Amino acid sequence: DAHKSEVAHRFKDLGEENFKALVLIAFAQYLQQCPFEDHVKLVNEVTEFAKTCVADESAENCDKSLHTLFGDKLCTVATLRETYGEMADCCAKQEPERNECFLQHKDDNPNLPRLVRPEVDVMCTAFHDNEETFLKKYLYEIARRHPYFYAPELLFFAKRYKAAFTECCQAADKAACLLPKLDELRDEGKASSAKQRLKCASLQKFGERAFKAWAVARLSQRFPKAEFAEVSKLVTDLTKVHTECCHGDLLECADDRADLAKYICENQDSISSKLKECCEKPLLEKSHCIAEVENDEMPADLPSLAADFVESKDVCKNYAEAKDVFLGMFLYEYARRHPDYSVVLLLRLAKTYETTLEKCCAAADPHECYAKVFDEFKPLVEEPQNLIKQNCELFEQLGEYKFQNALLVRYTKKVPQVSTPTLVEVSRNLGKVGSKCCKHPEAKRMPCAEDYLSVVLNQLCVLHEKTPVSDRVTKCCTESLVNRRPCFSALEVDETYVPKEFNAETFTFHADICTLSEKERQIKKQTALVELVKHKPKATKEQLKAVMDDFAAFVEKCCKADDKETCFAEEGKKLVAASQAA
Amino acid sequence: DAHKSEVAHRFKDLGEENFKALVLIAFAQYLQQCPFEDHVKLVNEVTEFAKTCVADESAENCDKSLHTLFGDKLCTVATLRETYGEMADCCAKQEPERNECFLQHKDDNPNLPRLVRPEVDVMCTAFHDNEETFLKKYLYEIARRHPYFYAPELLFFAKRYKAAFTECCQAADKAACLLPKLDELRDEGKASSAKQRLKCASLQKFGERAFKAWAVARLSQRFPKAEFAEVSKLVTDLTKVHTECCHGDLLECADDRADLAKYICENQDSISSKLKECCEKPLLEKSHCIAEVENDEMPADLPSLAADFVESKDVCKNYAEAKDVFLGMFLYEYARRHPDYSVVLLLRLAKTYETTLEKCCAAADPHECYAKVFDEFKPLVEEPQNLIKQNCELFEQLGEYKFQNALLVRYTKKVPQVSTPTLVEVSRNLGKVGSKCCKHPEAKRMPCAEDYLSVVLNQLCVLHEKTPVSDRVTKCCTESLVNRRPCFSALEVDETYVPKEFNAETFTFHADICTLSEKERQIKKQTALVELVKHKPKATKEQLKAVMDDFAAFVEKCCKADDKETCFAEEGKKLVAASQAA
Numbered sequence A, B: 001d002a003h004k005s006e007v008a009h010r011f012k013d014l015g016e017e018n019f020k021a022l023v024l025i026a027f028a029q030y031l032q033q034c035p036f037e038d039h040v041k042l043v044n045e046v047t048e049f050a051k052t053c054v055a056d057e058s059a060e061n062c063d064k065s066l067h068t069l070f071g072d073k074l075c076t077v078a079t080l081r082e083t084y085g086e087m088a089d090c091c092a093k094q095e096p097e098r099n100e101c102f103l104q105h106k107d108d109n110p111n112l113p114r115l116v117r118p119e120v121d122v123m124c125t126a127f128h129d130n131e132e133t134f135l136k137k138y139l140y141e142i143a144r145r146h147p148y149f150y151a152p153e154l155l156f157f158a159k160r161y162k163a164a165f166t167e168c169c170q171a172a173d174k175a176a177c178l179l180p181k182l183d184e185l186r187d188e189g190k191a192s193s194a195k196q197r198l199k200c201a202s203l204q205k206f207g208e209r210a211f212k213a214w215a216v217a218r219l220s221q222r223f224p225k226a227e228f229a230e231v232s233k234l235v236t237d238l239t240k241v242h243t244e245c246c247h248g249d250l251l252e253c254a255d256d257r258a259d260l261a262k263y264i265c266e267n268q269d270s271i272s273s274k275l276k277e278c279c280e281k282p283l284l285e286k287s288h289c290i291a292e293v294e295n296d297e298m299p300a301d302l303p304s305l306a307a308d309f310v311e312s313k314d315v316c317k318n319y320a321e322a323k324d325v326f327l328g329m330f331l332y333e334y335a336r337r338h339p340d341y342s343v344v345l346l347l348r349l350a351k352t353y354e355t356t357l358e359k360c361c362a363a364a365d366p367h368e369c370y371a372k373v374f375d376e377f378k379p380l381v382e383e384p385q386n387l388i389k390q391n392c393e394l395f396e397q398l399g400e401y402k403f404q405n406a407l408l409v410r411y412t413k414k415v416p417q418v419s420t421p422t423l424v425e426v427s428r429n430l431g432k433v434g435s436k437c438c439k440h441p442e443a444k445r446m447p448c449a450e451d452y453l454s455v456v457l458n459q460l461c462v463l464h465e466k467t468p469v470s471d472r473v474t475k476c477c478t479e480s481l482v483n484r485r486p487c488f489s490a491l492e493v494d495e496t497y498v499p500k501e502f503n504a505e506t507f508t509f510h511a512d513i514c515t516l517s518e519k520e521r522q523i524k525k526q527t528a529l530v531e532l533v534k535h536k537p538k539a540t541k542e543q544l545k546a547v548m549d550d551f552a553a554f555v556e557k558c559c560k561a562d563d564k565e566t567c568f569a570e571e572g573k574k575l576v577a578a579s580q581a582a
């Protein structure tokens, strides 16, 4: 924007309140390993500095460009820098240089605990004793575990967080009033983080060319009743925003986000009739809703494509002279008239249409060349549906657990070279899709699935990326985006895998297993199974799905055995030695 | 002791703040998981109750005992109990059954992150704004991370903690007065907590005859002015105490520790000269100190053994008739006039005398069979002095890191069959001894080493025991105790080893190494070297140390390299390739 003290420009538009946090995030998303006090200090130190910039724009450094004032204030530590012998010490670099050498250090999976909750009465207690130190830490614990969270969205949560307390902290059993709403939050937040990560990942990995086509797709379905170039307008608007939330430019990311809120609430009419009640609520609750709203009704008369995109004999006339924007119409039109279609599906189609025009505009009699181009669509607009059908029908039989086990093997046979902890975190999550998609009607089961799946396949690629072990994966991950899911399902087994070296400390379990949560114990069964298949890949399931039964009946035998931490080494000795038979 | 409302009978020996702390300890040592806010609450809930026991001796349940009233307030965690999902239903069992079924499985090795201290700028800030909380949080952290750790000592560290704060929170540079004293604190209690564990370990795994003979020794050193009947007595007193704190009875063991302190400070005149002062601090600090004081100046006169034990005509007289306490009479005599000897050396000596008297009282002409027994001592009193002498030179030539490497290679060839993650853990620590020992003078290095060592050897048996892979390592671990160091220092290489199959997926490294910490980046190089050796055992410390350099200079060339993870890919492949040379 046009301003000298760039700091203050945003400071105003966002407000002292939406600063101390939009800045707490920044530090949290950067230094993650660093404690609470360290971050509140630095924020309550960039606040004073940012207060003098509210005075005279030409003070100390007020003229600077945030990134500068940021990284600098970050090297105010150089203390815990011992935990960073290399990396995060590169403040020697200038601009951009070091700011890049910062967005890189962000750990996608930090070595942290789950946040254990104090009992419900102790939470409300701390909520009163200091209603602000409380809400701050929540905003922080999350932002350090999710370095790529939609920074502004993360604000809205702390709002629903405060409210969740301000209401639920008064009733005979306020306890059971609160949690069922914190959990909605816990998850619903964890879900947003995963979607956003994908958006950022599609920017830093496939430029914005790819990104836009996504918005053109999900912004059409959402606001179908709105001009093509009015959407192509919001699409480009939204892009700049998300580019700056991924780039770490939080303040301006929110500043731009709100700027859109205002705007779309102005052109509320030439956009849809669902923004109504959402504009009448805080600029905070504003942005959020607007994007996660309901789709609007289709157009009355519909040109039903065809003549508009396949029949018009002089196709290339508007193609070789347009390409982009022209294909953008095709998308806008197609997507807007398919609130049932998955976003990834519309793109496979559009990239299919593009694969046709570029092949037909190079042959005699082109206007009759394609024609049967929509003939390609059929298997592709069905294949996904037939897949969701299968795996859902299967999910409703094996149940979430045993199902995650099916994948644990299939996906672990396909690429054993992959980190064991990942194969679990991922496979478990793939199983989690069936739970929150096979509850939907056939029409809406299409997106939810292909979408949630897209998300999870990414947190596979973002994990493997830091530690590349199977170039087969990196092949599926780097080679195209709207070809990721198709790629993996296509992967076959691996005869070139040398069965992992035994290691008994692995298949050795202890009474520690007994004192575990139902899930963190399942996750142990999971991890066990993975390291297992990796040990002798060419093994059938009826055998695994037997050795596993044995183990389950074992862990459940030495958790009920009179007083046994002794049999985990006696019966466990037998189990290992026994299973090796077959 | 004795009293009606023991709940308030204790509130009169410590009286709040010394009571609000002992409660935060006992609790945070059981509910190691439940957060801080929960623990503070649970401490007040006992205070306000123990206050209504100051109101009138007989009220609600003031008459109740402690193990009982603690369990009651313990079955208050009706909330948090998912990690206790199959832990703590023993509230059904009554006294004493209920107490046991609690101790039996409270984590002995929690899964908590390493405290990342804030900036010293804010630690002091916090130390002022809220001195009370900031201080009691440390107690909860340290007490939870050390469940079986003594409670009194814990309190001591706490006052020295604030002492380091009240004193150092104002200086041109407080960041130089502070953490040198805090790092000092960490590894001290860490040593005390570990040296504590070993104590119980030996007591439980090897009866108490082996334990008494241990205290007899290090007591005779601490207090050489004391008679024997005095020392002998103190031992049985101390043996009762230590058998308790170990078993878990921390409520009475703590009492007895305070009971004993009275008797040692009662008659210092027939015990030690160094007592005087410490017997002036409150009853709490009068225990922790007395045990860890200093070695009283040797007597003004000494009959220089020999005549007592070597001749006596029939030493088999007051021996074959009294056996123990005779060797104890001896150990006392010997250990009192050898303060600088390690307490483990003195014990090998006393076992060498017994084994001798047993082989000389079995052949006609005893006083001529032995009388030449103090000869076998000559070597075994120098033999250790030899191994500490060498290694110290070596240490002060390679430094910690490179010294550990030489060990990772040595001990690894000795027992390749061991868990890599283990060999590193143990080898590193061995290299960590020389640091906090090779600084001390010549006299205070025989025990310093042999002490700090048997702890590191112990935390090898606890690791190996969990996963027995080499019968000649559990051998050394079980076979005797004072034959641990002698057994391991004996282990030859291993011509019978099957070189761990290649697999270079462990020999591949990725950018993440750079964004690691000083130690944890070296932990990987050492994890590497171990895995290296286990691939072609019969190499040479010439080639190993050689290739260890190429790699070290490689990870350096690849972290600063432009900005590449492709570096590690292309370069690492060149490293593996060239490493295959030799």
Ligand SMILES: CCN(CC)CC(=O)Nc1c(C)cccc1C
Pocket: A183, A186, A187, A428
């Ligand atoms: C059963 C529905 N949810 C919450 C009510 C389960 C869940 O969220 N599990 C989960 C969490 C919370 C964080 C990291 C990894 C996992 C597998």
